[PDB]
Design a protein around this ligand. Structure first.
Ligand SMILES: OC[C@H]1O[C@H](O[C@@H]2[C@@H](O)[C@@H](O)O[C@H](CO)[C@@H]2O)[C@H](O)[C@@H](O)[C@H]1O
Ligand SMILES: OC[C@H]1O[C@H](O[C@@H]2[C@@H](O)[C@H](O)O[C@H](CO)[C@@H]2O)[C@H](O)[C@@H](O)[C@H]1O
Ligand SMILES: OC[C@H]1O[C@H](O[C@@H]2[C@@H](O)[C@H](O)O[C@H](CO)[C@@H]2O)[C@H](O)[C@@H](O)[C@H]1O
Ligand SMILES: OC[C@H]1O[C@H](O[C@@H]2[C@@H](O)[C@H](O)O[C@H](CO)[C@@H]2O)[C@H](O)[C@@H](O)[C@H]1O
Ligand SMILES: [Ca+2]
Ligand SMILES: [Ca+2]
Ligand SMILES: [Ca+2]
Ligand SMILES: [Ca+2]
Ligand SMILES: [Mn+2]
Ligand SMILES: [Mn+2]
Ligand SMILES: [Mn+2]
Ligand SMILES: [Mn+2]
Lengths: 232, 232, 232, 232
């Protein structure tokens, strides 16, 4: 079978295994900081440089994958803790939307909240224009930040969060399990047909954004990934 | 929220947090060995001693959980490498079925393969009496070892296998990610209504079995777990 | 290593991880209330349901533990604010003393003040029959409410109190740090050989009590714990 | 009672409340990075700017204190993960030793390993010249990096570590509890007469160092502190 597998205990710019877009930067501690605290409508995204083949036009087979990552969001004076981080999957040529306003678009959608991507968002601000729930939340997005589904969550400033994601191609189910500083686990799952929503080859990554008054530290600390596609 | 969480990097015979049943034994290296290589129809099970409320009768709420564990199965002469291991959930009064014939029952069912439990099996022998697929496989079991669903897999003697399981209460989806020796991942997911199949309080654990001619080393090396039930 | 770690941010009566004894009750806010304000000689205790092995007869090793908890004691008309709360450790079979008179016994000892337990008391009433110092105090008890050692302290009605306790097995030192509302910390430490005073298997918990004329609200708000026993 | 209390959830290169010495820097994420990964024999230290009065020349009384802090150490290509971090107490005029060679001195002592300070070290390299134990370890130091006492420990690269320290003045005992990545807690306690070893007013802080071939990321993420001196 065809398998893609990698693991980042730390990140470093100048490492070809990753694409850097927007205001992203890598701190001396190896952490990826997606947004620039000193910019309006800041937007930063990171992508595994190598495109991953998630499905086949020859066989119709779709890959299954298991990926885990840890991130950290932390408040700062004197802006609102916004806007959040989104782990996403998109066409290999994906780029930050032209004239991106950042903010609630999480750096992957247009002003209306649309784009070509599937992702899991960790939202820390309620944008009514995208029908966000009243509190912080984890959401499953399919070509829109107006989540197909969300679950109440709480972004704890300064806390390291661990996420586990399983995509079962057979049932087309994307399951997500997220850590919480208080010890609880939060989960959300959703049937998502990657073959119908995304091209055969895609890029996986992370994006985060802020606005004029909405800014916070967005860090990606580690990331492991393994996908397997049955070939014939 | 009511949460039960723990993390076992190794095991010990004296830990009251673990219920030992049957032929289970603890090796000097901290590994748990489930079956006795010298006994016929051997059955050994290990359960977390703390009952877990997977659902509430008062609120109707159902918990979600994340758990990971690693195990190892190793051949031995001159017996057939059987029968396998099963990660299961059962009522808190659960015990090895009286008069258990072990073998293909995996220590959780009767001769007919029926029982009161939900589990994920790592089956290394094809029992036609339970409609097993022809090769080694991972299966989702609901009150029977005649799996509700299975996926082809391969048990490599002496290999360490990493497993990640996510149960999303909202969708009632049980997702399993199995990371093989060769690096490939294998997944299987199934909608299982724990609230409809099990009581409010249950126990989680592992069971393994053998027959007269089928015997192998069944080891549980580690186990982390977190389940959360929304209360109040 | 053998480790036991849990973290209660709040409580619930149906949570199997907690043994309730006596007049204990759970408030809608998740707080545990140990005594019954309307009962003479009230006694209420709460225990972590699972036995904790604090030392091994096979290795002679004793565990170290770090535990933090917050409680609150508030006066009421027209009773004297008594008698206090005690964080204790005792045999796994520990029950409220038969015919307990509550009051100065704190629900862990008999009339003479003797019992089988080790604990840190937050005493708010001076019982001369137990040689209490003249004012409120924190004390280290070993099989008796006639403290092996005490330190002047002040129980502020309605004040939330935080406590951190460290037990270093190697030095057998039980160190306590109490953070009052006014910000000051109060500490007391005492060498206590848990191995010599307690059985290998014990249970940790809290107890509070009152008399006919001595009653007050005793609340346990949170409790985190981690013990580690070196296994060799 | 004279109480000194503070809390840092993040730091900033501009808050005078902290003295920055040597190569220390403050990252955009609010973390303090003690050493410069690009410098030979790098040394960085941070001190709470306000001197703390730990004892009275009038009463002879000594203060008790409770402090908690979190840190992180991560490896880097292609140097040995060294040398570690030390939480220390020293005269208010304390400065990095003249002509410091960094390395095993941890930035608080001369070449022989001598200095004027009391501290808890999180050592990640075995210096025979200072009688270090063979593995990583937590040590209690008194005017020397040739620890008065040590306990085996393990520094996990990329892991956030929480530490809690209690100093009980009456028993002159310094107790430490370290919360590791795998869940276990590591403790060490030692009687240290602060009044006999340190001046009336001191500064508390953190220090880390590296050498030519020994370098790693030394981060301080947070730090809470409370000390109380009884005045009669
Ligand atoms: O506060 C941060 C947020 O900023 C923007 O949201 C609104 C803004 O449109 C306007 O309504 O004013 C309020 C309060 O001043 C908010 O700032 C972004 O649209 C959000 O994404 C978020 O960053
Ligand atoms: O061979 C291991 C195997 O033993 C038992 O079943 C087999 C059966 O499938 C085969 O047809 O015949 C042999 C010899 O009579 C055994 O009966 C167990 O039931 C099975 O689980 C496995 O352990
Ligand atoms: O007042 C509350 C107090 O009641 C009981 O003791 C007192 C005793 O200290 C006092 O001297 O006399 C009264 C009247 O007889 C009570 O005996 C409890 O023993 C004590 O713990 C406290 O609850
Ligand atoms: O390798 C990091 C390590 O360097 C130094 O330790 C010894 C050094 O004293 C000795 O002379 O040579 C060996 C190998 O070249 C090591 O470098 C530092 O003293 C030590 O603190 C640590 O930083
Ligand atoms: Ca939003
Ligand atoms: Ca079978
Ligand atoms: Ca008393
Ligand atoms: Ca050293
Ligand atoms: Mn959203
Ligand atoms: Mn089967
Ligand atoms: Mn007392
Ligand atoms: Mn050392």
């Amino acid at each position: 079978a065809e398998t893609v597998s990698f693991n980042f205990n730390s990140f470093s710019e100048g490492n070809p295994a990753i694409n850097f877009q927007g205001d992203v930067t890598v701190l001396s501690n190896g952490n990826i900081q997606l947004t620039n605290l000193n910019k309006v409508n800041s937007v930063g995204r990171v992508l595994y440089a190598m495109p991953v083949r998630i499905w086949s036009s020859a066989t119709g087979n779709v890959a299954s994958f298991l990926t885990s990552f840890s991130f950290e969001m932390k408040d700062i004076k004197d802006y609102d803790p916004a806007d959040g981080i989104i782990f996403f999957i998109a066409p290999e040529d994906t780029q930050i939307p032209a004239g991106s306003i950042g903010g609630g678009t999480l750096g992957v959608s247009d002003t209306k909240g649309a784009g070509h991507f599937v992702g899991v968002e960790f939202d820390t601000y309620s944008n009514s224009e995208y029908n966000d729930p009243p509190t912080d939340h984890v959401g499953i997005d399919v070509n829109s930040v107006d989540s197909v589904k969300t679950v109440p969550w709480n972004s704890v400033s300064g806390a390291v969060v661990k996420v586990t994601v399983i995509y079962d191609s057979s049932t087309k189910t994307l399951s997500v399990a997220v850590t919480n500083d208080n010890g609880d686990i939060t989960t959300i799952a959703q049937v998502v047909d990657l073959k119908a929503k995304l091209p055969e080859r895609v890029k996986f990554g992370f994006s985060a954004s802020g606005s004029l008054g909405g800014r916070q530290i967005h860090l990606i600390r580690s990331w492991s990934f393994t996908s397997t596609l049955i070939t014939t």
